[PDB]
Amino acid sequence: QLTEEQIAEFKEAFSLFDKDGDGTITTKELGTVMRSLGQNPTEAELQDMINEVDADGNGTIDFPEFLTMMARKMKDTDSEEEIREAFRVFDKDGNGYISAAELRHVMTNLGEKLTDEEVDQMIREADIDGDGQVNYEEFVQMMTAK
């Protein structure tokens, strides 16, 4: 039962990637509407949703065909919240950033012996912009991206 606000997005976004400005989007086009929204269906997981409705010329959904598609995986998920609290937990100093020092730290009270090496290592693979630390964003990515 998405909120109205929850809807405006799903249109602002759904439209922005509607090249031929009608009101329906291709498959690749869908892939992008969502990716941009910060999500990302699999090459094949992308069909079973759209594929599931084929009244528009087999392979093209309308605005609703989409809006009503934002249930299957959405009328359930709310982790986006926890993950942000998980983050504030590892950012032990209040800087909005997670340093290898603090990863290793929180990582051990929870009882995990990490090698000084294999930490600077995790931190690195979570760092995308290269500033050595992981911010909420980089973090959010590392968590959800499967």
Partner: protein, 735 residues
């Protein structure tokens, strides 16, 4: 606090290899005492006179009792102590000369010494007998009346027993001594002089070196924290405004320790403190009636709402009653009303608390009634004798705001079922938050799980698996029919509390009925004073929303405890439509963080739903589509910024490859900011976005080579037709 500051690194080692030699002689502790007192030492080049950056007009020469012997020819000085606030010792050196006549470097010791005396032991706790009796070494203990080195013009008064009768008057003179003693005990030359003349001051100083210096370097280190702290009133001084019933708070004290977790409570009304100990059960979620703070009923939830705080609120009451009824209607068998039976102690309590006035008696239907007075002006009250029931009626010269008027009726209160017995209701213990230690949550996860997780070969996936574990077994909060919204441990915790206040004596059931206000996303409340019970057992009560916040950051946030805060903070909680602020680190860093594809598209959607106009309108102006096509371009760069393939790169490249992508976005933004009539609302936004990008790219630069300013760097680029070589250009700019 780096104690020593070396001004001019002018002379070769000679100057340096001199200051060192000087200090390496003074005991590491004697320095710690200095730094502790906040002092700093200044070693500067040729600055003899009032020339040092700290050598100007402040507390200077006021009275003249200066060096060992007194002199005061200032201008002829090279060592000095800025006496007043933090001690500021300033010394300068010139050529190769302190050792021949060490009679010079000695002033660096006394000149110093006046560092620790008056705040050392001589007077720092007070002239504690140790130094008070050691000072007695004038001429009464040892056959060494050889104090002619420290006691001349001020103590040739051998003819006067020097204890408490006279030592005060000249605290000052007894410093001139502890100093010279110090200067001697440590002077590179005359140490033995001190050991051969006064025989005690030597041992005194010696014990000081023995560990006496680490002494004060602790009673000061400890008072370092305790001093500058967060003003919370700890102890029963708090347990008072706390509201909680003492036997309980204490009962709780055990759990805190055992489980190791801070327990925080909101204000528990005082007018219910005892109704609790008494055995009155507490309000659950099922009842939403308003308590009261006056008359006999006070501290109970009068079924009649005109008898509660909202007395007069023809609409609050009108909606208040409306709520007890449903409370009963809906939850019959467990929620209903019963007669107010103030007991014994309660009466005498609402007495010295000036809520009710017990006086004249009376007779009715053969039963005795002690009129129970209350300065209210519409209801009169009286309590029975047989049973202590209480009644009221509408004065013969008034009316109920709802428009009701009646004769003597009993005062009914809301009551929940509790062991098949409708017990009356009063305030409950509304937990503000619960902060278990991370280590505790660890013992909340079923070994096998945490095991199946850690026994993985993927460095980064392990981390993830853990975080989720930590999320599942610790941060997650589910809803509940009974106890509201809370975590699982939150619940097991919620029990240990009640069972704890049960083996105490409570017979009203539970005192903590639901989850933490941290889940009051609905109708968040802001209490100034918060009662907290640390894992040690101490009681604490903050005074401000801020102090609480500050408190939590210092003791919970950044110590090892799990804590989350009300999701509705910094937002606008729907229910009561309230904005309650709480420091959020993520937001701290927002200014310096380029936004995401989604975080971007979001803010668009937002505005659309406000100034009904969107970035691009569905029309034909090939200018509109220009804009559409153009934001779609930004919502790409931003998307590229955060690429997860950025791992197959090195740190060095990441910043570069990113700083660029970042610039890219910034560009297309300048591009659209310079477009047609883009509503001024969006105009502002993009203006906002720009700054982020700017801040971001700057931050990414500072991490590398930093003489480059976004502003400049940008100029030097060309996003006209060919973007190609442009990037090769860029790299070159950062070398």
């Amino acid at each position: 606090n780096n104690l020593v500051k070396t001004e001019f690194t002018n002379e070769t080692l000679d100057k340096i290899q001199q200051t060192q030699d000087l200090l390496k002689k003074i005991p590491k502790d004697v320095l710690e005492i200095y730094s502790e007192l906040g002092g700093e030492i200044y070693f500067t080049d040729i600055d003899l006179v009032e020339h040092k950056e700290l050598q100007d007009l402040s507390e200077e020469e006021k009275n003249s009792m200066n060096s060992r012997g007194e002199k005061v020819p200032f201008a002829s000085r090279f060592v000095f102590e800025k006496k007043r606030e933090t001690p500021k010792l300033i010394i300068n050196i010139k050529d190769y000369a302190i050792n021949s006549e060490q009679s010079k470097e000695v002033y660096y010791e006394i000149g110093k010494g006046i560092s620790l005396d008056i705040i050392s032991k001589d007077k720092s706790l007070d002239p504690e007998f140790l130094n008070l009796i050691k000072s007695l070494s004038d001429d009464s203990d040892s056959s060494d009346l050889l104090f002619s080195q420290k006691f001349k013009e001020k103590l040739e008064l051998n003819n006067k027993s020097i204890d408490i009768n006279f030592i005060k008057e000249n605290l000052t003179e007894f410093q001139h001594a502890f100093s010279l003693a110090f200067s001697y005990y440590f002077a590179p030359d005359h140490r033995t002089v001190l050991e051969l003349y006064a025989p005690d001051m030597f041992e005194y100083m010696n014990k000081l070196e023995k560990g006496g210096f680490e002494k004060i370097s602790e009673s000061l280190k400890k008072e370092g924290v305790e001093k500058d702290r967060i003003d919370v009133l700890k102890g029963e001084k708090a347990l008072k405004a706390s509201g909680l019933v003492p036997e309980h708070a204490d009962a709780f004290k055990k759990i805190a320790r055992e489980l190791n977790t801070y327990i925080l409570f909101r204000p528990v009304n005082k007018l219910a403190t005892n109704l609790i100990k008494s055995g009155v059960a507490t309000k659950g979620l099922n009842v939403h009636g308003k308590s009261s703070d006056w008359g006999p009923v006070a501290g109970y939830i009068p079924f009649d709402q005109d008898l509660s705080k909202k007395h007069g609120q023809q609409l609050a009451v009108e909606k208040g009653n409306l709520e007890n009824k449903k409370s009963i209607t809906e939850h019959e068998g467990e929620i209903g009303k019963i007669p107010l039976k103030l007991d014994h102690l309660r009466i005498e309590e609402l007495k010295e608390n000036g809520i009710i006035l017990k006086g004249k008696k009376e007779i009715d239907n053969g039963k005795k009634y002690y009129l129970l007075e209350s300065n209210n002006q519409v209801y009169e009250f009286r309590i029975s004798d047989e049973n202590n029931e209480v009644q009221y009626k509408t004065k013969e010269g008034k009316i109920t705001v709802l428009g009701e008027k009646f004769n003597w009726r009993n005062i009914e209160v809301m009551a929940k079922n509790v062991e098949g017995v409708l017990k009356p209701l009063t305030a409950d213990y509304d937990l503000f938050a619960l902060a278990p230690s991370l280590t505790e949550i660890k013992k909340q996860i079923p070994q096998k799980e945490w095991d199946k997780v850690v026994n993985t070969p993927n460095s980064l996936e392990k981390q993830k698996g853990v975080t989720n574990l930590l999320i599942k077994y610790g941060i997650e909060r589910k809803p509940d029919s009974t106890k509201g919204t809370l975590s699982n441990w939150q619940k097991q915790m919620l029990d240990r509390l009640n069972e704890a206040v049960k083996y105490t004596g409570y017979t009203g059931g539970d005192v903590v009925n639901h989850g933490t206000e941290q889940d009051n996303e609905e109708f968040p409340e802001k209490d100034n004073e918060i009662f907290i019970i640390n894992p040690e057992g101490e009681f604490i009560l903050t005074k401000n929303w801020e102090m609480t916040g500050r408190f939590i950051e210092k003791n919970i946030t950044g110590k090892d405890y799990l804590y989350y805060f009300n999701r509705s903070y910094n937002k606008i909680a729907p229910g009561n439509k309230a904005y309650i602020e709480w420091t959020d680190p993520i937001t701290k860093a927002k200014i310096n963080t380029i936004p995401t594809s989604a975080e971007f598209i979001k803010n668009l959607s937002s505005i659309r739903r406000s100034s009904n106009v969107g970035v691009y309108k569905d029309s034909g102006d090939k200018d509109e589509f220009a804009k559409k096509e153009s934001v779609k371009k930004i919502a790409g760069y931003l998307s590229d910024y955060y690429n997860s393939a950025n791992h197959i790169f090195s740190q060095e490249k990441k910043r570069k490859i990113s700083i660029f992508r970042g610039i890219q976005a910034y560009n297309e933004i300048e591009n659209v900011l310079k477009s047609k009539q883009i509503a001024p609302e969006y105009k502002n936004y993009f203006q906002y976005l720009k700054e982020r990008i700017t801040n971001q790219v700057q931050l990414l630069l500072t991490h590398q080579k930093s003489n480059i300013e976004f502003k400049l760097l940008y100029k030097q680029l060309n996003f006209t037709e060919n973007e190609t070589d442009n990037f090769e250009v860029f790299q070159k700019i950062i070398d």
